[PDB]
Amino acid sequence: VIKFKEPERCDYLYVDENNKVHILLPIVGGDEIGLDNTCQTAVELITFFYGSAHSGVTKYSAEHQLSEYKRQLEEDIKAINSQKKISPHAYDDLLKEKIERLQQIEKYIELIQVLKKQYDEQNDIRQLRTGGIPQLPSGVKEIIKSSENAFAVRLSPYDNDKFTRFDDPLFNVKRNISKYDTPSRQAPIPIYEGLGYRLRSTLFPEDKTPTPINKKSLRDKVKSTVLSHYKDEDRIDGEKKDEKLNELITNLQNELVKELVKSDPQYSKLSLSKDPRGKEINYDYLVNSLMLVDNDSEIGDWIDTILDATVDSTVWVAQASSPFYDGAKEISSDRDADKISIRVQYLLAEANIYCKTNKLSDANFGEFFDKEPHATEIAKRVKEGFTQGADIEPIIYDYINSNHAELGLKSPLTGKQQQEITDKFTKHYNTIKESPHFDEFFVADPDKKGNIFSHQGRISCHFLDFFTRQTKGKHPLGDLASHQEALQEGTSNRLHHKNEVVAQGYEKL
Amino acid sequence: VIKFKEPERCDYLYVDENNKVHILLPIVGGDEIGLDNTCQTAVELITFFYGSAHSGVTKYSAEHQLSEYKRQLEEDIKAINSQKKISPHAYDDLLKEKIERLQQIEKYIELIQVLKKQYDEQNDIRQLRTGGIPQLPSGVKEIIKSSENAFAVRLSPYDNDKFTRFDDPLFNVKRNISKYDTPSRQAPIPIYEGLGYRLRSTLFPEDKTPTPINKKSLRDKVKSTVLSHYKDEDRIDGEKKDEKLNELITNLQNELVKELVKSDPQYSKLSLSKDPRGKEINYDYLVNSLMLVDNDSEIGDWIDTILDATVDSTVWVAQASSPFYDGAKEISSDRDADKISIRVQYLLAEANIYCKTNKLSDANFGEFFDKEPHATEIAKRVKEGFTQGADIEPIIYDYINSNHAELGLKSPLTGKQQQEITDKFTKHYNTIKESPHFDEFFVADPDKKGNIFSHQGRISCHFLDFFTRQTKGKHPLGDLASHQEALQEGTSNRLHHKNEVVAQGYEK
After folding, report:
1. Residue B54: beta bridge partners?
2. H helices within B299-391, ranges in order?
3. How far apart are CA A108 and CA A464, in angstroms?
4. Gap between the Cα atoms of A73 and A66, Å rounded
């Protein structure tokens, strides 16, 4: 049993179950949302074609890595040959499979060479190497433009960056003139129209009035809502003390289950009239048995005691935090309002994506939301949402649903669909929240059918798809002509990082 | 192929590899940190003994569930017995295993019945059903008192609750007089000594001066530090413009890498002098080729540009957040200071647990930290930590290490050990951060040997352990007398929720 040298893993390379080699051309780093935007958009393509340096480590080109891999295959084939004087036919399958991978690798290397040598007369590939802030090559742009499962979205930050590199955004909204298009390169020229401006100027207005953010835990909210219908002087006392306690219990229960059923319908059966042992919650029990309150206790103390006696601690366990509530107490600056503006925009963009990838609508939601009165109205509802500590996402969904037909949808979004958007929004926003620029993001869904894949932490297209478009059908693929279709016949656009087929050739001992 | 009725899963029940049946008596819900505390501490024991209603769903007692399980076993043995006139030996293993389990289950049921009927004259069990705010039964207390792997900790919230139910806490600190010990039940009577008070009154003092929390992202922190060496009027301009740029690039690179290498040493090779294609970052390139800044730009604009030209976006990806930094900009009320006090206390309690559980010390750390000058000194260092945006945990660890011998430790805590405590603190605090009360928590380590286990989302003791102690060992266990030892001979105190031998009879 000789030890083989063919690597289990190679950048850009995927071997399917039928021993077909697929090279995945990267667009940007990431899994579902791209980690590169604006000026760095081209970095993965630069690396693929030429190599590049990252934190002092050289990342080599596809051609370099595939030539290394070829050398290793050739060593394995030689090693089989020498070992076949001693076991004349014991390695026949493996030798054939290895040669077939070698032939396919050599063909891909040739295709890269020929693209650069013969089919780049416009320097559309060479500009990755030589341009100041390069562009995606035209074949990648055409792939993106025709994708069914990945879309770019373009937002409006106050200090917008002109070097957007995704030209066919699904969601797009009016932007300022970038500072980089002005002579001093110091500040953008603002527009006083559209979604971004309405959000910013509503959340933190020219008069500098801070917008309070009154976010409460579920428990503090319930208690607060209930106590708004009482006043400080109210007591549980006098001859009608039991009627007053019953009304309190009833009000507290109603508010609590109202808030819980939003998250889970099981809680519609929650009751506060009894402890878990079936003991009646009444005045004597709370005052004389448990000794937690008395006749002169404030209503808020009565509430605390009722809840500690009747509600399991599992009910206060929080939902993961929304991106809208990061711990701040108020929106007290233009920067803060810009940050929140971008979050609202991003949520709208995620709804748009969900609607496009599920074939619910083909509209640019940003076009509707940029128009009056929608821009103003959404900003006002979100601002009010913050001052009430309400959930922001359903404010957006309700407005979308009220206007569903104008946004190109046949029906309103279901509760289920709303929760799906919310989870994608939360996860993607958390991945990109430390981006230097929020002007655009590329969002892929590799659980859906389409031309864009996830592989090795790159959002990618099939190299052969790219190659045929970039060379305008002038160089047909020969033996590789059905590889593209074979990759689509797979069960997922999320592809494995290592190649199990290169390990499981060996299992016959 | 007859279809068996013996369940794969039953509350409180665990079957080991040798077909021994263990009933786990629950203490509180959770896995490592108990979710019930104070006045609801008893809820799992209430349910085990009597059943209870939870959010409108009835939960059945152990006896009820085990009787149901027994009926199902009896149906499975009948189904085999009638079928064994027609295939005399075809079911030999399953029948024998099922009989071994049934005899055990019956024995456990009789044990529960007798405990309640005859061995509860103290009403130590019955007071679960009766008492206003029940207590743990004495046998559970003794189990806890005797544990090597699970410990209660007791903290000092401003608004402390007198109905603590864990009587033998490892970590304990001075507490106020609970409001529940005062005529109107509305406010505590504060003490003006000890750890809790020093934290609260240092973080938000009587004069109402807010403590700033100056926590920055890595990018904002780098840029701020660099810019502190410059003045607003500074430009990259005039005859020495390239030297000034070089000095800016060198300062920015030194600060960036200084901050990154804390978290990953690979970044010691990071360079800002070239873009990823090898293009020189110089004035002509930034100003005339890319057209991003000019001679009139502020130094902060130069920084942003340099970073966007040279630094991959994966470098800005933040580490996971400490419980100490939740997004607030200042400690500006007594409630905020209480919230942060508690977190510091909980961290000290987790360091204590770690040290007890790893046999590094037996001390109650709260005793030391409650004393002057330690209470004052730790508060002051934490407060200073917040205003600098520094990591709070190592501040605590450094103080512990300066005083390691007085805290009963032979040696200071290693970097490794510190990180282990931090991870436990973070994960456990996040699980309990919405608790109505922060007075006490029960923390179990089921990866360590001891008498407390994790099972079906309950932190538990062996029912036989409890039974023998509650009974004072009168009623000897008969056939079950060595089951307790057998469970210890297992490889983990984390026990599987569904059962191995009752699931895998089906496949073979």
Report:
1. B57
2. 299-310, 334-357, 365-370, 374-388
3. 9
4. 10
Residue B40 Cα to chain centre, angstroms = 19
Angle formed by the axes of helices A392-402 and A374-387, to 10°?
A: 150
Question: Which strand (E) or helix (H) includes residue B283?
Answer: helix B283-284
Touching check for B29 and chain A: CB below 8 Å?
yes
Question: Is A328 in contact with B326 (Cβ distance < 8 A)?
Answer: no
Residue B293 with chain A: CB contacts under 8 Å:
185
CB-neighbour burial class of residue A463 (10 A; exposed 0-12, middle 13-18, buried 19+): buried
Between CA A348 and CA A336 the distance in angstroms is 19
From CA B65, how far away is CA B429, in angstroms rounded? 34
Taking the Cβ of residue B46 and every Cβ of chain A, the question of whether any pair is shorter than 8 Å is answered with yes
Find out whether A188 and A174 touch, Cβ atoms under 8 Å: no
Reported for B252-259, long-range contacts at CB under 8 A and 24+ positions apart, including other chains, are B252/B222, B252/B226, B252/B303, B252/B306, B252/B307, B255/B222, B255/B225, B255/B226, B256/B222, B256/B311, B259/B218, B259/B221, B259/B222
Q: Are residues A328 and B327, on separate chains, in Cβ contact within 8 Å?
A: yes
* CB-based contacts of A289, cutoff 8 Å, min separation 6: B132
Distance from C-alpha of A491 to C-alpha of A27, rounded to nearest angstrom: 22
CB contact under 8 Å between A434 and B219, yes or no, is yes
Nearest to A297 among B35, B184, B294 (CB): B184
List the structure tokens of A67: 């030539």
> Which of B43, B178, B185, B303 is the mutation pick for testing A, counting most A CBs within 10 A?
B185
Cα–Cα distance for residue pair B495/B508, rounded to 1 Å? 24
| Residue A429 to residue A33: CA distance in whole angstroms | 9
Here the contacts of B383-388 (C-beta below 8 Å, separation 24 or greater) are: B383/B202, B383/B203, B383/B211, B386/B203, B386/B211, B386/B212, B386/B213, B386/B214, B386/B324, B386/B331, B386/B340, B387/B211, B387/B212, B387/B213, B387/B214, B388/B214
Whole-number CA gyration radius for chain B? 31
Query: Which of residues 248 through 287 in chain A touch B, CB cutoff 8 A?
Result: 266-267, 269-271, 274, 276-278, 285
Angle of helix B62-83 relative to helix B92-117, nearest 10 degrees?
150
Is the distance from CB of B70 to CB of B23 less than 8 angstroms?
no
Question: Could B292 and A185 be called an inter-chain contact, meaning their C-beta atoms sit closer than 8 Å?
Answer: yes
Q: What resolution in angstrom units was achieved for this structure?
A: 2.0
C-alpha distances out from residue B241 to A184, A186, B129, B232, Å = 18, 19, 82, 16
Indicate the residue type of A410. K
Nearest by CB: B55 against A267, A277, A307: A267
Experimental determination technique: X-ray
Spatial contact of A299 and A305, defined as CB atoms under 8 Å apart: no
**Cβ(A12)–Cβ(A65) under 8 Å?**
yes
A92-100, Cβ contacts within 8 angstroms, sequence gap of 24 or more: A93/A505, A93/A508, A94/A505, A94/A506, A97/A19, A97/A505, A98/A6, A98/A73, A98/A505, A100/A19
User: Is B53 in contact with A276 (Cβ distance < 8 A)?
Assistant: yes
Virtual torsion, Cα A200, A205, A210, A211, nearest 10 deg: -60
**Chain B contact set for A270 (CB, 8 A):** 55-56
With tokens 């190659």, the residue in question is: A467
Which two structure tokens, joined as six digits, stand for A151?
């879309």
Determine whether the interchain pair A436/B316 forms a contact, defined as Cβ–Cβ distance below 8 Å: yes
Terminal alpha carbon distance of chain A: 8
B157's CB contacts (< 8 A; 6+ apart) are B196, B338, B341, B342, B437, B438, B439
How far is A195 from A349, CA to CA, in rounded Å?
A: 12
The residue written with tokens 């004349």 in the block is A88
Look at strands B452-455 and B494-495 and give their pairing. Answer: parallel
First to last CA, chain B: 12
